[PDB]
């Protein structure tokens, strides 16, 4: 149907922070391919004047998780955390990034 607006591929953590710090709502997020841990995924989320990062852990059966509940896809991990806080420390609900045409963020080629 429609491609997802939250999968960004291999972008630096600092660039994930640059982009999300321009979003106005807490919870605006993205999933990126980690540079520090090749083959793993990181979830970055705007939270006040900061951006929090979550490491997407994998088990022996290939499932994805952040805390205790395990998922069969990033899509399911993301959708679950739209209604239940992505964090066990503070209440942060995931919400799609909003297009901001006047404020683009650039990565290097």
């Amino acid at each position: 149907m429609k491609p997802h607006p939250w999968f960004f591929g291999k972008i630096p953590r600092a660039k994930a922070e640059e982009m999300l710090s321009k979003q106005r709502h807490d919870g605006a997020f993205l999933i990126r391919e980690s540079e520090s841990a090749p083959g793993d995924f990181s979830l970055s989320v705007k939270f006040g004047n900061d951006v929090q990062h979550f490491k997407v852990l994998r088990d022996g059966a290939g499932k994805y998780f952040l805390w205790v509940v395990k998922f069969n896809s990033l899509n399911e991990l993301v959708d679950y955390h739209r209604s239940t806080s992505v964090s066990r420390n503070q209440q942060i609900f995931l919400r799609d990034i909003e297009q901001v045409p006047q404020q683009p963020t650039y990565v290097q080629a």
């Binding site: 990062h53 852990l57 066990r88 420390n89």
Partner: peptide, 5 residues
């Protein structure tokens, strides 16, 4: 990271 060291 929020969830792991």
């Amino acid at each position: 990271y929020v969830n792991v060291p």
